[model samples]
Target: MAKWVCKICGYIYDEDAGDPDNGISPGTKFEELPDDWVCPICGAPKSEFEKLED
Candidate 1:
């Protein structure tokens, strides 16, 4: 699975280690996250994220 990075705050969300801080469990894919999910560090919306590069 791919990871996602927040454009505004540089927060990296890993599908292998989902954001437990926001009630997102591990193994949750980027596409499975709620639309309301925001960058835990900067509160940036999901729309602000893009697929992280290798």
Candidate 2:
């Protein structure tokens, strides 16, 4: 399970916790996020998130 971080605002996307604030349910992987999903903190698109080091 890889984690992702928003390049713009450093918002971490945890697969185990998801982005509940943006209506993203828990257990949702980064790859499962909708194309329209943006960072809740900075409004950055999914492309702005990069995979975090393991």
Candidate 3:
């Protein structure tokens, strides 16, 4: 399962980003985020991210 996140900022894009019914969606690849994907917090990109460990 891929968890997408913002780069410039540390906003992690989960299944609750945008519209609950149409957010980033589950299993979204970290590298598949659109160029327009802005961090809901700091407004960054999908280029500045690190995989979270569980």
Candidate 4:
């Protein structure tokens, strides 16, 4: 599972632990998220995140 870090706030988006609070189901990959997907915490753009590790 790839872990993406939100540079804007350091919030991490874990592929294995999707943002269920934001409509993203578990095991959802970053690429599988909707184009409108933003930082569920900082409300930043998807591009704000940088892949930290796989």
Give the best candidate by TM-score: 4
Kindly give the stretch of ten consecutive residues in candidate 3 with the minimal lDDT sum. Answer: 14-23
Candidate 1 clashing pairs?
none
Top candidate when judged by lDDT against the true structure: 4
When 3 and 4 are scored with TM-score, the better candidate is 4
TM-score of 2: 0.87
Q: Write the per-residue lDDT of candidate 2 for residues 1-54, one digit (tens) a residue.
A: 678999999888888998887888999999999999998889999999999885
Candidate 4 worst ten-residue window by lDDT = 45-54
What C-alpha lDDT, on a 0 to 100 scale, does residue 11 get in candidate 2? 84
Candidates in descending TM-score order = 4, 1, 2, 3
Residue-level lDDT tens digits of model 3 in 1-54: 544556566566664333234356555655665677666678555556666766
Report the C-alpha lDDT of model 4 over 1-54, residue by residue, as the tens digit.
899999999999999999999899999999999999999888999988999865
Candidate 2 has its poorest 10 consecutive residues by lDDT at 13-22
- True-vs-predicted CA distance for residue 27, candidate 1, Å: 0.5
Give the C-alpha lDDT of model 2. Answer: 0.89
- Model 1 bad stretches (over 4 Å): none
TM-score of 3: 0.48
**Which pairs of residues have clashing backbones in candidate 2?**
none
* Candidate 4: regions farther than 4 A off: none
Instruction: Name the candidate, 2 or 4, with the larger TM-score value.
Output: 4
What are the TM-scores, per candidate, against the unseen true structure?
A: 0.88, 0.87, 0.48, 0.91
Model 3 off-target regions past 4 Å? 2-9, 14-22
